[PDB]
Amino acid sequence: IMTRKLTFGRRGAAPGEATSLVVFLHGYGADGADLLGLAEPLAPHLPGTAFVAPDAPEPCRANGFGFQWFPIPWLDGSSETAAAEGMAAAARDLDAFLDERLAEEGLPPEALALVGFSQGTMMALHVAPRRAEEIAGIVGFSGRLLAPERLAEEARSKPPVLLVHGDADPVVPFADMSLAGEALAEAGFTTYGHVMKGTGHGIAPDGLSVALAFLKERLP
Amino acid sequence: IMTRKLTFGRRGAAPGEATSLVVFLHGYGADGADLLGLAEPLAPHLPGTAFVAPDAPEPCRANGFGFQWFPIPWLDGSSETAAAEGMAAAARDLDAFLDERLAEEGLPPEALALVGFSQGTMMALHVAPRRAEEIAGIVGFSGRLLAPERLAEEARSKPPVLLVHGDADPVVPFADMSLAGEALAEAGFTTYGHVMKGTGHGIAPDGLSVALAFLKERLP
Ligand code: NA
Ligand code: NA
Ligand code: NA
Ligand code: NA
Ligand code: NA
Ligand code: NA
Ligand code: NA
Ligand code: NA
Ligand code: NA
Ligand code: NA
Ligand code: NA
Ligand code: NA
Ligand code: NA
Ligand code: NA
Fold first, then answer.
1. B66 to chain A: which residues are within 8 Å by CB?
2. What are the two backbone dihedrals, phi and then psi, of residue A212, each rounded to the nearest 5 degrees?
3. A with B: how many residue pairs have Cβ under 8 Å apart?
4. How many Å lie between the centroid of ligand 13 and the Cα of residue A63?
5. C or N terminus of chain B, fewer CB within 10 Å?
């Protein structure tokens, strides 16, 4: 079948000159541009890093101009089958996208990290472990692990994962952080956590700070 | 008390040179920039029109980088009181914003139209009727009327309203269009409708087309 080509923005290290690559994965109803803005405070501390943020391949069922990786039944009326098929198709697309970025940036998988937010975190946690080669790592903000029971079997690679979550998150339950964390840890992933105390569904400065330290240490 | 100043983008007629003003009001979790993009196809057909799109004054409870006019309890866990207070505060802010735009553009209220999407439509339908002077009109996409029972008493002005809604809208029930429509019509508002057949929660070309005709006719 066919992959949908993802549009994306870029920041950071001059083309041709990237030592490493961070791919931002936005949340439901958003777009690449929002998260890519995090490249501003991060870039000076990650000199040779290129930042990219694709737009999810489908229009968002719940808003006018945003994108979704896949639909969310409890929210937008989609069926569970549509949600599942959507995730598989989005994973197909993102996998192809990562290959393309690594190919064009001239980098190996160990110099790529994924940084997700919410639905984007679900995408990162699904796609990365299923890659043939282990990437540098995953930072997952405010998200969850969609199919924990499958992780065991299907994980082909096991990059380190930092999960960051607000303990007052009103849309993705804080408990999902521990649930995702233990599924990962038990499957052999080196897993880290940071709790954004008093934070809702968003990225607070302390969350960005810990993500930076994690990336700075993992990226070549 | 105090109003929050709204950031906004602008398009269209050269500053100083505007014959009319269209204010876009974005939906929950979005921002001004998205809707303001509609200025591109509209501008050539509305020569002297200035387009502006404010960002809603609060961070969105449900996403990372978007804005809300007020929270949505069924979706983000907020209380009904928080939702009600949020709407009152947002209305205070938008009212002040409109005054400022009219003041700076050097225009009278009859050369201002509001174009809403979803939550933004709820804002338009709340604020416009409560203005002292009647504006040119309101185009409400894919939204609803929050307090129909109060409309009677509190409407101080009654500009014409065009409601546009997708009959397959999975997040704002198509029925809300008729409900909003009859509340308005019975309160003395000249009310129009266009159904976007087969459309979900978004703006299809036929919806944009009818909005343009409506604006072109109402704006000086
Ligand atoms: Na895309
Ligand atoms: Na995002
Ligand atoms: Na999401
Ligand atoms: Na984008
Ligand atoms: Na839709
Ligand atoms: Na997470
Ligand atoms: Na989880
Ligand atoms: Na604002
Ligand atoms: Na919008
Ligand atoms: Na909305
Ligand atoms: Na904006
Ligand atoms: Na929140
Ligand atoms: Na509407
Ligand atoms: Na309604």
1. 29-30, 34
2. -60, -50
3. 86
4. 14
5. N
